[PDB]
Amino acid sequence: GMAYTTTVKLDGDTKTYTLSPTVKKYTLMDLGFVKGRSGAFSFERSLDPTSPYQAAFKLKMTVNADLTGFKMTTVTGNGVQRANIFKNDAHPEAVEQLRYILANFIERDILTTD
Template identity: 55%
Template structure:
């Protein structure tokens, strides 16, 4: 998956972009970890009962220049992209996904595009 300026999750009809007001401290405040090469990475479990259970993940990586990013819902090991919208428990996973994305939008990290 390549870095782009807008991302649409597999199975979703909404496109997300990085906010033009994004700041590095906003990324850190929302749980992103800065890697040695300057990229910011966030992994969040989509299991609403416990963030430690093996479940689907939301993975977001922002390039160091804060211009491009990639975002995907993946299996619990993070290696394979999945469509949570077609899962038998889609309502549970999408509710948690929407909660996380809403927080990132409110904190000026993402915008709907």
């Protein structure tokens, strides 16, 4: 199917992220991804909380078990509702934190961008 992709553009973003064609299981693990029983790898981080477990947003990413496609989204602190952290630059602290997190993935051959 088409739900896992090789590129993702977060809601509102001007950048697109691409899954590295050379992404490695052990590197995913080293960056904090957890492999589920299905073989897929997941990662989640809170963004810009006001108090413990009161995040403004969360970043979620899953890589498929075959290591050839991914999903990545921003949601609100409830972990479900789609969020747009970029529109009108209304959430700069969340964007800085997101970029910091993803910069590590760029440096370790997980994601690229244009």
